[PDB]
Amino acid sequence: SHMAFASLIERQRIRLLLALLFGACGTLAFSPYDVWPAAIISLMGLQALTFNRRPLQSAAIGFCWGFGLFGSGINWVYVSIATFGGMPGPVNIFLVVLLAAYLSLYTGLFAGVLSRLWPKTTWLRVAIAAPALWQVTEFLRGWVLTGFPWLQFGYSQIDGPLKGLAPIMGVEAINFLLMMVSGLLALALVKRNWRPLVVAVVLFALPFPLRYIQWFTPQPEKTIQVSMVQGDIPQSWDEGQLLNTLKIYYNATAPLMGKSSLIIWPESAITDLEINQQPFLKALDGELRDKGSSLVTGIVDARLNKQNRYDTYNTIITLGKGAPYSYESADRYNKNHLVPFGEFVPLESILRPLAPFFDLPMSSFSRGPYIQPPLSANGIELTAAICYEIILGEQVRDNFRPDTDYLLTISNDAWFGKSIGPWQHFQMARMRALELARPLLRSTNNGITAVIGPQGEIQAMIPQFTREVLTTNVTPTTGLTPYARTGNWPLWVLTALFGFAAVLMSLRQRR
Ligand SMILES: CCCCCCCCC/C=C/CCCCCC(=O)OC[C@@H](O)CO
Ligand SMILES: CCCCCCCCC/C=C/CCCCCC(=O)OC[C@@H](O)CO
Ligand SMILES: CCCCCCCCC/C=C/CCCCCC(=O)OC[C@@H](O)CO
Ligand SMILES: CCCCCCCCC/C=C/CCCCCC(=O)OC[C@@H](O)CO
Ligand SMILES: CCCCCCCCC/C=C/CCCCCC(=O)OC[C@@H](O)CO
Ligand SMILES: CCCCCCCCC/C=C\CCCCCC(=O)OC[C@@H](O)CO
Ligand SMILES: CCCCCCCCC/C=C\CCCCCC(=O)OC[C@@H](O)CO
Ligand SMILES: CCCCCCCCC/C=C\CCCCCC(=O)OC[C@@H](O)CO
C-alpha cells in the first residue's frame, strides 16, 4: 500500500542505471563498431539525466555514466593484465574496475560542477557551459598523472559528417560541437520544444561541407613504393629467439631492397640493445645502400650518458640510402610519452627511496624530448611517434614541420590480442593524418598495419595476426592545415569565451 518505485531515492537509482547504459552505448561510437550516432545518444543521456538534480546527485550520475563508458570501452586492458600480470583473475578484474572508476571521476566532476553553477534547465547550461566545462574536465583527464585521453567522441567522426572540423581546429573541436549538439537535443526532449532541436540540427549540419576541403596538395613527382613488415612475433631473453626474429625481418626485407624506397619495421622489432647489434645493423645498412633503399625500425637503445649510467630508450633508427647508419647518428627518435602502467608506473619516483632494490625493475625507460626533428630517410622527412604517442594530437602537431612528407607511427598492439583496443588505437591514429593533411605510415607487430591518406582514409591495410608485408605506392603531400598552423589555442579561446560568458551569467543569477 505504498509506491516504493516512486520514492525520491529510487528515482535517483533509476537515473544511475540509465546513466550506466547511456555511457556504455557511447562505446559503440568507436571502432570496430563505428556507429557515430551512438556518441550523440550517449551524450544526450548524460545531459538529460543530470537535469533538475542537486550537484552531488548530478556527480553520481556523471560518475555512473563514465563507468558505463570506460567500463565497456577500455576493459580490453584486461587482456594484457591477465596474460602477463601473473595475478589472480579477481585481482585483474578489480584493477580494471579501478581504472574505469578513476576515469569516471572526471565525468562526475563535469556533472557535479555543471549542476552547481547552472542548475536551471536552459540552453545556456547545455550549449554554452557544458561544452566549455567538458573541454576543461577532459583536458584534466588527459593531463593528471601523465593522463589517459582515451575515448573522446570526436574520434568517432573520422568517417562522419563533422570530420571537416578536425583539420581546422583539431579533434577537440569535434568533442566541443558534439557536446553542444547533444545538449540541445536533450533540451528539446525534456522541454518538448522544437526550437533547440532546429538549432542543434543547423549547428550539426553547418560543418558538413568542410569535409570536402583539401588543405593539401599532392606531390606525385615524389611518389615511392613503401613496404611495412608485419613480423607477427609473439610476446617474450633468448638470443636464439632474437635471431629467429632478425631472420623473419631480414628475409622479408631482402627481396624489397631496390624496389621499395622505404622499408619499415615496427616498435622494438629488433628485440636487442642497439649496442649489441652493431654488426647486424652496419651490414644491413650496406645492403640497403648498395641497392638504393632505406630502412626504419624500432629498437631498444641503452645509451651510456655522461654520468656513466644507461638511459634506456624506446627508439626508432634509420639505415641505408640517405640515412647512413651510425650509433652516433642524430637521425633517430626516442619515445617521449611513456605508456602509464606499461613503461612506467605513475608516482613511482616519489615512492622509490623506500622500495627494496631487489624488487625494482631491472631497467626502466627514459624519455626523449617533447620535440624532436623529423627522421630523414632516402630524402623523405618522417614525423615520428611510437604507439600511444599517436593519440596525443597536440604533441604530434608540435613535432610536425611544414616540410614533413609523412607521419610515421610504429607500434606493437599484440598485448591486447583480439580485443577492441587495437581498433580504437587505429582510429585515433587516422585522426592525426586528417588533422595535419599528411599520409600516415602505421607499421605494427600484428596490429593494424596500414597507410592512411591525408584525409584520414585507409589507402591500404593488411589483416591482423598475419606474418606479411604491406607494399604499396604512397604519395607525399604539402600544405598547412589551419590546425597545423595554430594548434589548439583557438579552441581554448572559444572555450574561455563560452565559459566566461556562462560563469558571468551564473554569478548574475545568484544574489
Ligand atoms: C531497480 C533500482 C535498484 C537497483 C539498481 C541500484 C542502483 C545502481 C545501478 C547502477 C549502478 C551505477 C554504476 C556504479 C559505478 C561504480 C561501481 O559500480 O563500482 C566501481 C568502484 O570501483 C567505485 O569505487
Ligand atoms: C562551416 C561552419 C561550421 C561551424 C558550426 C559549428 C556550430 C557550433 C559553434 C558555436 C555555436 C554558438 C552557440 C549557439 C547556441 C545557441 C543555443 O543554444 O540556442 C538554443 C535556443 O535558441 C533554443 O531555444
Ligand atoms: C586510490 C586508488 C588507486 C589509484 C587510482 C586508480 C588509478 C588507475 C588504476 C589502474 C590500474 C591498472 C590498469 C591497467 C594497466 C594495463 C597496462 O599495463 O597496459 C599497458 C601495457 O599493456 C603496455 O605494455
Ligand atoms: C598509479 C598512481 C596513482 C593512480 C594514477 C593512475 C591512473 C592515471 C594515469 C592513467 C592510466 C591509464 C591506464 C591505462 C593505460 C594503458 C594503455 O593504454 O595501454 C597502452 C595502450 O594504450 C597502447 O596502445
Ligand atoms: C568548436 C566548436 C565547433 C567548431 C566551430 C568553428 C567552425 C569553423 C568553420 C571553418 C572556418 C574556416 C577557418 C579559416 C581557414 C582559412 C585559412 O586559414 O586560410 C589559410 C590557410 O592556408 C590556413 O591553413
Ligand atoms: C530511456 C531508454 C532506455 C535506456 C537505454 C538506451 C540507451 C543505452 C543503450 C544501452 C546499452 C549500451 C550497450 C552497448 C555497449 C556494449 C558494448 O558493445 O561493449 C563492447 C565491449 O564490452 C567489448 O569489450
Ligand atoms: C580510483 C578510485 C575511484 C573511487 C570512486 C569513488 C566513487 C564510488 C562510486 C559509487 C557510487 C556512485 C556515486 C559517486 C559520486 C561521487 C563520485 O564518484 O565522483 C564525484 C566527483 O565530483 C569526483 O571529483
Ligand atoms: C564488460 C562490458 C559489459 C558491456 C555491457 C554494458 C552495460 C553494463 C555496464 C557497462 C560496463 C561494465 C562495468 C563494469 C566494469 C568493467 C570491468 O571491470 O570489466 C572487466 C572485464 O570485462 C575484463 O574482461
XYZ file of C-alpha atoms and ligand atoms in Angstrom:
703
model
C 0.000 0.000 0.000
C 2.926 2.284 -0.849
C 4.810 3.266 -4.013
C 8.407 2.289 -3.303
C 9.092 2.506 -7.054
C 8.348 6.261 -6.900
C 10.445 7.328 -3.895
C 12.981 10.102 -4.411
C 15.931 7.806 -3.719
C 14.558 5.156 -6.083
C 14.130 7.721 -8.866
C 17.786 8.632 -8.368
C 18.822 4.967 -8.565
C 16.887 4.647 -11.821
C 18.901 7.588 -13.152
C 22.157 5.884 -12.145
C 21.252 2.701 -14.025
C 20.250 4.627 -17.147
C 23.463 6.644 -16.867
C 25.366 3.352 -16.849
C 23.638 2.178 -20.045
C 23.886 5.529 -21.831
C 27.600 5.643 -21.053
C 28.121 2.128 -22.402
C 26.260 2.978 -25.598
C 28.989 5.527 -26.323
C 31.478 2.699 -26.795
C 29.584 1.806 -29.975
C 30.701 5.145 -31.439
C 34.301 3.933 -31.676
C 35.903 1.311 -33.867
C 35.299 -1.500 -34.587
C 31.575 -0.697 -34.237
C 31.828 2.793 -35.772
C 28.222 3.780 -35.064
C 28.846 7.514 -34.843
C 25.249 8.431 -33.843
C 25.777 6.462 -30.613
C 28.108 9.214 -29.400
C 25.184 11.654 -29.603
C 22.799 9.229 -27.901
C 25.330 8.721 -25.119
C 25.913 12.442 -24.554
C 22.191 13.196 -24.678
C 21.707 10.789 -21.789
C 24.461 12.465 -19.812
C 22.991 15.930 -20.360
C 19.370 14.882 -19.782
C 19.864 12.590 -16.786
C 21.612 15.418 -14.898
C 18.776 17.966 -15.248
C 16.967 19.045 -12.070
C 19.425 17.306 -9.758
C 21.312 18.549 -6.747
C 25.053 18.801 -7.502
C 26.035 15.658 -5.578
C 23.258 13.723 -7.333
C 24.471 15.031 -10.696
C 28.045 13.998 -9.871
C 26.888 10.468 -9.040
C 25.038 10.302 -12.357
C 28.070 11.577 -14.258
C 30.300 9.055 -12.496
C 27.989 6.177 -13.401
C 27.776 7.433 -16.989
C 31.560 7.376 -17.192
C 31.628 3.980 -15.543
C 29.430 2.636 -18.326
C 31.626 4.245 -20.981
C 35.050 3.271 -19.640
C 33.804 0.032 -18.100
C 32.666 -1.172 -21.520
C 35.157 0.796 -23.624
C 38.624 0.205 -22.144
C 38.209 -3.124 -20.376
C 40.377 -4.562 -23.172
C 43.353 -3.641 -20.955
C 42.327 -6.759 -19.003
C 43.781 -8.832 -21.845
C 47.288 -7.552 -21.144
C 46.937 -7.743 -17.348
C 45.555 -11.282 -17.428
C 48.066 -12.604 -19.964
C 51.251 -11.119 -18.467
C 50.492 -9.825 -14.955
C 50.757 -13.088 -13.025
C 47.916 -12.046 -10.750
C 44.687 -13.759 -9.663
C 41.776 -13.290 -12.039
C 39.717 -11.407 -9.430
C 42.626 -9.021 -8.839
C 42.771 -8.483 -12.604
C 39.066 -7.635 -12.764
C 39.388 -5.291 -9.787
C 42.332 -3.441 -11.345
C 40.206 -2.828 -14.441
C 37.231 -1.727 -12.349
C 39.658 0.595 -10.551
C 40.829 2.117 -13.828
C 37.245 2.689 -15.013
C 36.274 4.260 -11.674
C 39.305 6.554 -11.751
C 38.494 7.903 -15.213
C 34.826 8.279 -14.193
C 35.875 10.834 -11.568
C 36.308 13.364 -14.375
C 32.817 12.796 -15.771
C 31.384 13.014 -12.265
C 33.379 16.214 -11.831
C 31.890 17.581 -15.053
C 28.349 16.683 -13.987
C 28.688 17.960 -10.433
C 30.188 21.288 -11.473
C 27.665 21.791 -14.280
C 24.797 21.198 -11.864
C 26.110 23.571 -9.187
C 26.745 26.596 -11.383
C 23.917 26.100 -13.927
C 21.098 24.376 -12.021
C 18.303 25.622 -14.301
C 17.478 23.552 -17.399
C 18.300 26.123 -20.089
C 20.071 26.440 -23.420
C 22.940 28.235 -21.659
C 23.689 25.222 -19.467
C 23.823 22.748 -22.338
C 25.036 24.787 -25.324
C 27.481 27.244 -23.710
C 28.589 25.994 -20.286
C 28.679 22.223 -20.842
C 30.958 22.334 -23.929
C 33.383 24.687 -22.186
C 33.378 22.616 -19.000
C 33.695 19.327 -20.884
C 36.805 20.717 -22.572
C 38.319 21.518 -19.171
C 37.408 18.257 -17.423
C 38.585 16.230 -20.441
C 41.859 18.144 -20.526
C 42.388 17.195 -16.871
C 41.629 13.539 -17.596
C 44.326 13.696 -20.273
C 46.850 15.603 -18.133
C 46.735 14.472 -14.495
C 49.397 11.818 -13.794
C 50.534 11.921 -17.461
C 46.925 11.291 -18.449
C 44.754 8.896 -20.427
C 42.682 10.716 -23.070
C 41.158 7.511 -24.455
C 37.573 7.534 -25.773
C 36.994 11.109 -26.944
C 33.857 11.114 -29.080
C 35.419 13.416 -31.673
C 37.436 10.458 -32.953
C 34.164 8.705 -33.855
C 33.691 11.293 -36.631
C 36.716 10.220 -38.695
C 34.184 8.834 -41.203
C 31.374 11.131 -40.107
C 29.764 14.385 -41.222
C 31.849 16.528 -38.812
C 35.272 15.328 -39.967
C 35.918 18.588 -41.819
C 36.320 20.378 -38.485
C 39.418 18.428 -37.415
C 41.885 19.934 -39.949
C 40.728 23.401 -38.879
C 40.662 23.202 -35.085
C 41.607 19.610 -34.222
C 39.605 16.701 -32.894
C 38.738 18.566 -29.696
C 36.602 20.931 -31.757
C 34.509 17.869 -32.586
C 34.234 16.918 -28.900
C 33.071 20.505 -28.344
C 30.375 20.547 -31.044
C 29.099 17.068 -30.182
C 28.542 18.014 -26.531
C 26.807 21.205 -27.650
C 24.535 19.453 -30.149
C 23.702 16.552 -27.833
C 22.810 19.023 -25.088
C 20.468 20.888 -27.404
C 18.783 17.604 -28.328
C 18.383 16.697 -24.652
C 16.936 20.163 -24.022
C 14.426 19.838 -26.864
C 13.375 16.472 -25.450
C 12.709 17.377 -21.817
C 11.101 20.765 -22.534
C 9.253 19.248 -25.541
C 10.336 22.321 -27.520
C 11.251 22.358 -31.212
C 13.493 25.443 -31.135
C 16.582 23.794 -29.547
C 16.231 20.876 -31.965
C 16.304 23.114 -35.038
C 19.306 24.945 -33.590
C 21.016 21.607 -32.918
C 20.388 20.379 -36.467
C 21.709 23.584 -38.051
C 24.825 23.505 -35.872
C 25.395 19.824 -36.579
C 24.894 20.450 -40.306
C 26.909 23.652 -40.809
C 30.262 21.754 -40.785
C 29.199 19.174 -43.404
C 30.735 20.895 -46.475
C 34.137 21.292 -44.775
C 34.757 17.567 -45.288
C 35.285 18.389 -48.982
C 38.200 20.774 -48.346
C 41.698 19.548 -49.216
C 44.111 21.813 -47.344
C 46.986 19.998 -49.049
C 48.498 19.487 -52.466
C 49.752 16.063 -53.595
C 53.317 15.702 -54.879
C 53.328 12.853 -57.444
C 56.884 13.577 -58.584
C 57.780 12.185 -55.125
C 55.669 9.013 -55.233
C 57.523 5.967 -53.896
C 56.966 2.311 -53.118
C 56.914 1.833 -49.334
C 56.932 -1.545 -47.583
C 55.933 -2.337 -43.998
C 56.956 -5.674 -42.497
C 54.414 -7.100 -40.042
C 56.504 -9.815 -38.424
C 53.733 -11.006 -36.097
C 56.255 -12.024 -33.425
C 54.654 -13.452 -30.238
C 55.433 -11.764 -26.936
C 58.503 -12.908 -24.977
C 65.510 -13.179 -23.172
C 66.734 -15.759 -25.700
C 69.406 -14.773 -28.203
C 68.143 -17.607 -30.400
C 64.600 -16.240 -30.397
C 66.159 -12.855 -31.155
C 67.989 -14.380 -34.120
C 64.829 -16.080 -35.377
C 63.284 -12.584 -35.307
C 66.087 -10.971 -37.297
C 65.694 -13.874 -39.740
C 61.981 -13.212 -40.314
C 62.512 -9.486 -40.749
C 65.678 -9.706 -42.848
C 64.294 -12.340 -45.220
C 61.021 -10.443 -45.672
C 63.054 -7.303 -46.407
C 65.796 -8.548 -48.740
C 63.578 -9.001 -51.850
C 62.216 -5.449 -51.350
C 65.643 -3.786 -51.494
C 65.963 -1.954 -54.804
C 62.162 -1.868 -55.223
C 60.825 -0.218 -52.053
C 62.356 3.187 -51.418
C 61.286 2.928 -47.769
C 61.027 -0.200 -45.620
C 59.547 -0.055 -42.104
C 59.774 -2.439 -39.132
C 57.516 -1.958 -36.090
C 58.096 -0.917 -32.474
C 61.002 -2.815 -30.920
C 61.194 -5.092 -33.963
C 64.851 -5.702 -33.114
C 64.410 -7.018 -29.565
C 68.017 -6.409 -28.546
C 70.089 -3.430 -27.483
C 71.380 -1.282 -30.332
C 74.900 -1.593 -28.883
C 74.741 -5.401 -29.120
C 73.655 -5.353 -32.780
C 76.292 -3.192 -34.457
C 77.479 -5.934 -36.869
C 73.918 -6.675 -37.968
C 72.988 -3.013 -38.343
C 76.100 -1.980 -40.288
C 75.816 -4.981 -42.626
C 72.116 -4.231 -43.141
C 72.963 -0.568 -43.775
C 75.342 -1.590 -46.565
C 72.940 -3.962 -48.320
C 70.237 -1.283 -48.279
C 72.642 1.370 -49.541
C 74.080 -0.761 -52.352
C 70.508 -1.235 -53.649
C 69.155 2.283 -53.080
C 66.669 1.534 -50.274
C 66.153 2.829 -46.740
C 65.049 1.094 -43.550
C 63.345 2.499 -40.466
C 62.928 0.188 -37.476
C 62.176 0.118 -33.791
C 64.865 -0.953 -31.346
C 65.767 -0.578 -27.666
C 68.715 1.753 -27.041
C 70.524 1.667 -23.700
C 72.785 4.661 -24.354
C 75.532 5.423 -21.860
C 75.154 9.014 -20.685
C 77.811 11.376 -19.366
C 77.057 10.213 -15.797
C 78.060 6.705 -16.948
C 74.553 5.401 -16.405
C 72.328 3.877 -19.059
C 69.353 5.751 -20.432
C 67.122 3.053 -21.908
C 65.096 4.410 -24.821
C 62.276 3.015 -26.927
C 63.754 4.119 -30.212
C 63.465 4.419 -33.987
C 66.650 4.198 -36.078
C 67.343 4.681 -39.788
C 69.654 2.901 -42.219
C 70.559 2.746 -45.871
C 70.292 5.351 -48.587
C 70.083 8.913 -47.331
C 70.363 7.678 -43.729
C 73.817 6.149 -43.192
C 73.522 4.110 -40.037
C 75.686 5.084 -37.079
C 75.359 4.641 -33.332
C 76.195 8.364 -33.062
C 73.726 9.474 -35.732
C 71.110 12.058 -34.799
C 68.748 10.526 -37.403
C 66.693 8.788 -34.738
C 63.683 9.155 -32.459
C 63.318 8.383 -28.745
C 59.826 7.880 -27.299
C 58.836 10.848 -25.158
C 55.469 9.873 -23.652
C 55.735 6.532 -21.882
C 52.661 4.337 -21.522
C 51.289 4.572 -17.960
C 51.454 1.180 -16.224
C 53.179 -0.167 -19.325
C 56.557 1.567 -19.455
C 56.353 3.259 -16.023
C 54.019 3.463 -13.034
C 52.733 6.951 -12.103
C 54.015 8.300 -8.758
C 56.909 5.810 -8.741
C 59.637 8.446 -8.358
C 58.132 9.617 -5.060
C 57.950 6.110 -3.585
C 61.264 4.724 -4.854
C 63.556 5.633 -1.894
C 61.667 3.060 0.207
C 61.490 0.180 -2.271
C 63.908 -2.744 -1.846
C 66.466 -2.724 -4.646
C 65.774 -6.380 -5.480
C 62.071 -5.588 -6.148
C 62.665 -2.650 -8.503
C 62.543 -3.301 -12.258
C 65.898 -4.248 -13.745
C 65.666 -1.341 -16.198
C 63.168 1.473 -16.656
C 62.674 3.562 -19.771
C 63.904 7.129 -20.196
C 62.075 9.882 -22.067
C 63.140 11.549 -25.286
C 62.459 15.280 -25.622
C 58.959 16.558 -26.287
C 60.101 17.957 -29.661
C 62.432 16.028 -31.952
C 63.407 16.611 -35.591
C 61.778 14.511 -38.300
C 63.618 11.371 -39.245
C 65.189 11.555 -42.701
C 65.448 8.538 -44.992
C 66.006 8.329 -48.749
C 65.269 12.054 -48.906
C 61.940 11.574 -47.085
C 61.032 13.569 -43.954
C 59.113 11.487 -41.390
C 57.447 12.928 -38.300
C 57.624 10.036 -35.863
C 55.542 8.818 -32.935
C 55.653 5.485 -31.114
C 52.496 3.572 -30.200
C 50.412 5.511 -27.610
C 52.033 8.787 -28.727
C 49.988 8.983 -31.935
C 46.861 9.684 -29.825
C 48.461 12.885 -28.450
C 47.282 15.264 -31.146
C 48.913 18.433 -29.831
C 52.281 16.716 -29.372
C 52.151 15.215 -32.862
C 51.247 18.661 -34.186
C 54.121 20.258 -32.219
C 56.698 17.903 -33.785
C 55.209 18.323 -37.260
C 57.180 20.539 -39.656
C 55.756 22.040 -42.872
C 58.368 20.023 -44.793
C 57.175 16.757 -43.239
C 56.299 14.352 -46.049
C 54.689 11.597 -43.981
C 53.598 10.848 -40.473
C 55.194 7.683 -39.139
C 53.934 5.529 -36.300
C 55.314 2.141 -35.318
C 53.519 0.115 -32.685
C 53.049 -3.276 -31.071
C 49.431 -3.887 -30.020
C 49.895 -7.639 -29.536
C 49.487 -7.118 -25.780
C 45.728 -6.765 -26.262
C 45.110 -9.699 -28.601
C 41.740 -9.806 -30.349
C 40.099 -7.004 -28.369
C 38.693 -3.660 -29.498
C 41.702 -1.847 -28.035
C 43.874 -2.002 -31.148
C 40.911 -0.802 -33.230
C 40.278 2.251 -31.066
C 44.017 2.973 -31.228
C 43.999 2.640 -35.026
C 41.022 5.008 -35.223
C 42.810 7.730 -33.273
C 45.883 7.283 -35.475
C 43.741 8.156 -38.513
C 42.698 11.477 -36.958
C 46.308 12.733 -36.967
C 46.570 12.344 -40.751
C 43.305 14.240 -41.223
C 44.320 17.000 -38.790
C 47.719 17.577 -40.434
C 46.860 16.621 -44.047
C 49.709 14.135 -44.472
C 49.691 10.410 -45.183
C 50.460 8.253 -42.157
C 52.517 5.059 -42.345
C 51.462 2.833 -39.431
C 53.681 -0.252 -39.048
C 52.769 -2.755 -36.328
C 53.842 -6.117 -34.961
C 50.492 -7.744 -35.683
C 48.011 -4.947 -35.113
C 46.545 -2.916 -37.967
C 49.411 -2.008 -40.254
C 48.185 0.468 -42.837
C 48.701 3.540 -44.973
C 46.318 6.358 -44.066
C 45.591 9.057 -46.611
C 45.762 12.783 -45.977
C 42.034 12.911 -45.144
C 42.061 10.016 -42.679
C 41.023 7.416 -45.253
C 42.500 3.922 -45.317
C 44.516 3.692 -48.533
C 45.952 0.249 -47.739
C 45.868 -2.293 -44.923
C 46.802 -5.879 -44.105
C 44.874 -8.151 -41.733
C 45.842 -8.524 -38.109
C 47.551 -11.661 -36.835
C 49.400 -12.403 -40.081
C 53.089 -12.587 -40.961
C 53.062 -10.470 -44.101
C 54.356 -7.357 -45.875
C 52.183 -4.408 -46.914
C 53.671 -2.952 -50.103
C 52.077 -0.067 -51.979
C 52.776 3.235 -53.670
C 52.411 6.282 -51.456
C 52.413 9.933 -52.440
C 53.504 12.709 -50.059
C 51.567 15.930 -49.633
C 52.439 19.505 -48.744
C 50.445 22.392 -47.385
C 49.457 23.577 -43.923
C 46.084 22.876 -42.385
C 44.769 25.614 -40.078
C 45.196 23.280 -37.099
C 48.825 22.640 -38.043
C 49.499 26.395 -38.139
C 47.803 27.189 -34.800
C 47.400 24.120 -32.641
C 44.534 24.029 -30.167
C 44.817 27.581 -28.810
C 41.867 28.787 -30.963
C 39.582 26.192 -29.359
C 40.801 27.285 -25.928
C 39.921 30.905 -26.746
C 36.418 29.787 -27.695
C 36.290 27.698 -24.515
C 37.330 30.729 -22.457
C 34.667 32.932 -24.060
C 31.879 30.348 -23.709
C 32.989 29.689 -20.139
C 33.480 33.333 -19.215
C 30.037 34.188 -20.590
C 28.401 31.261 -18.773
C 30.088 31.880 -15.412
C 29.282 35.593 -15.584
C 25.623 34.749 -16.156
C 25.579 32.163 -13.369
C 27.004 34.715 -10.921
C 24.340 37.204 -12.014
C 21.608 34.608 -11.449
C 22.840 34.488 -7.850
C 22.313 37.399 -5.441
C 15.944 -1.017 -9.613
C 16.737 0.037 -8.871
C 17.691 -0.543 -7.838
C 18.825 -1.388 -8.406
C 19.954 -0.577 -9.029
C 20.830 0.121 -7.997
C 21.388 1.468 -8.429
C 22.637 1.439 -9.280
C 22.579 0.780 -10.666
C 23.709 1.420 -11.401
C 24.925 1.481 -10.883
C 25.884 2.566 -11.229
C 27.343 2.224 -11.505
C 28.287 2.329 -10.311
C 29.711 2.578 -10.784
C 30.842 2.231 -9.826
C 30.902 0.777 -9.445
O 29.947 0.062 -9.587
O 31.985 0.400 -8.719
C 33.286 0.963 -9.018
C 34.109 1.132 -7.754
O 35.467 0.826 -8.045
C 33.976 2.536 -7.208
O 34.993 2.835 -6.257
C 31.117 25.992 -41.572
C 30.736 26.365 -40.153
C 30.742 25.178 -39.200
C 30.706 25.510 -37.715
C 29.404 25.221 -36.981
C 29.645 24.919 -35.507
C 28.498 25.258 -34.567
C 28.909 25.385 -33.103
C 29.743 26.636 -32.809
C 29.125 27.623 -31.859
C 27.855 27.995 -31.788
C 27.336 29.076 -30.878
C 26.311 28.644 -29.825
C 24.853 28.614 -30.275
C 23.907 28.059 -29.220
C 22.576 28.786 -29.121
C 21.552 28.000 -28.359
O 21.811 27.024 -27.703
O 20.300 28.425 -28.589
C 19.257 27.489 -28.229
C 17.935 28.191 -28.034
O 17.732 29.179 -29.033
C 16.783 27.205 -28.038
O 15.553 27.825 -27.683
C 43.059 5.341 -4.887
C 43.052 4.094 -5.748
C 44.320 3.855 -6.561
C 44.722 4.968 -7.520
C 43.667 5.349 -8.550
C 43.406 4.324 -9.647
C 44.289 4.501 -10.876
C 44.045 3.523 -12.013
C 44.350 2.069 -11.648
C 44.935 1.270 -12.772
C 45.342 0.017 -12.672
C 45.966 -0.798 -13.761
C 45.398 -0.508 -15.151
C 45.849 -1.490 -16.225
C 47.142 -1.200 -16.975
C 47.252 -2.031 -18.251
C 48.600 -1.942 -18.904
O 49.638 -2.057 -18.317
O 48.520 -1.599 -20.196
C 49.756 -1.184 -20.823
C 50.659 -2.343 -21.196
O 49.919 -3.412 -21.762
C 51.733 -1.884 -22.173
O 52.682 -2.897 -22.488
C 49.468 4.906 -10.067
C 49.463 6.176 -9.243
C 48.091 6.614 -8.750
C 46.930 6.376 -9.706
C 47.037 7.039 -11.073
C 46.982 6.101 -12.273
C 45.937 6.498 -13.307
C 46.262 7.762 -14.088
C 47.119 7.537 -15.333
C 46.397 6.810 -16.425
C 46.355 5.498 -16.584
C 45.698 4.786 -17.725
C 45.775 3.261 -17.632
C 45.636 2.553 -18.976
C 46.840 2.787 -19.864
C 47.328 1.529 -20.547
C 47.179 1.546 -22.038
O 46.644 2.407 -22.682
O 47.977 0.620 -22.563
C 48.741 1.018 -23.722
C 47.943 1.148 -24.987
O 47.117 2.297 -24.938
C 48.889 1.241 -26.169
O 48.211 1.270 -27.418
C 34.498 24.130 -31.551
C 33.043 24.324 -31.921
C 32.681 23.857 -33.322
C 33.504 24.458 -34.455
C 33.375 25.965 -34.635
C 34.302 26.550 -35.693
C 33.863 26.353 -37.139
C 34.932 26.709 -38.164
C 34.461 26.714 -39.622
C 35.583 26.913 -40.595
C 36.327 28.001 -40.694
C 37.484 28.208 -41.627
C 38.715 28.771 -40.911
C 39.645 29.580 -41.807
C 40.680 28.774 -42.565
C 41.267 29.550 -43.727
C 42.724 29.868 -43.581
O 43.356 29.800 -42.556
O 43.272 30.116 -44.779
C 44.711 29.993 -44.867
C 45.039 28.512 -44.845
O 46.134 28.237 -45.710
C 45.351 28.001 -43.451
O 45.973 26.720 -43.491
C 15.433 5.522 -21.669
C 15.797 4.490 -22.716
C 16.412 3.210 -22.166
C 17.873 3.285 -21.742
C 18.845 2.515 -22.627
C 19.046 3.053 -24.038
C 20.362 3.779 -24.294
C 21.635 2.991 -23.990
C 21.785 1.623 -24.670
C 22.124 0.513 -23.706
C 23.269 -0.144 -23.568
C 24.538 0.029 -24.358
C 25.262 -1.286 -24.679
C 26.333 -1.184 -25.761
C 27.782 -1.217 -25.285
C 28.313 -2.618 -25.046
C 29.463 -2.996 -25.937
O 29.428 -3.008 -27.140
O 30.534 -3.393 -25.233
C 31.610 -3.983 -26.000
C 32.811 -4.239 -25.114
O 32.417 -4.673 -23.820
C 33.755 -5.266 -25.723
O 34.921 -5.458 -24.927
C 40.110 5.028 -8.418
C 39.235 5.386 -7.238
C 37.785 5.628 -7.616
C 36.872 5.996 -6.454
C 35.398 6.091 -6.826
C 34.506 6.695 -5.749
C 33.036 6.778 -6.136
C 32.254 5.489 -5.945
C 31.038 5.338 -6.864
C 29.794 4.855 -6.176
C 28.574 5.321 -6.386
C 28.191 6.396 -7.363
C 28.265 7.842 -6.855
C 29.633 8.521 -6.824
C 29.568 10.046 -6.650
C 30.905 10.766 -6.464
C 31.947 10.411 -7.493
O 32.190 9.263 -7.756
O 32.581 11.439 -8.115
C 32.332 12.804 -7.701
C 33.268 13.735 -8.444
O 32.947 15.072 -8.072
C 34.724 13.482 -8.149
O 35.519 14.639 -8.397
C 32.132 -5.726 -19.532
C 31.415 -4.938 -20.609
C 29.900 -5.001 -20.493
C 29.104 -4.497 -21.691
C 27.649 -4.169 -21.370
C 27.405 -2.718 -20.967
C 26.429 -2.487 -19.819
C 26.938 -2.854 -18.425
C 27.824 -1.824 -17.708
C 28.995 -1.336 -18.504
C 30.268 -1.677 -18.385
C 30.898 -2.622 -17.404
C 31.050 -2.033 -15.999
C 31.932 -2.817 -15.033
C 33.435 -2.617 -15.198
C 34.033 -3.431 -16.326
C 35.126 -4.364 -15.892
O 35.833 -4.232 -14.925
O 35.255 -5.370 -16.761
C 36.360 -6.275 -16.536
C 36.248 -7.394 -17.544
O 35.309 -7.030 -18.551
C 37.569 -7.742 -18.187
O 37.421 -8.800 -19.131
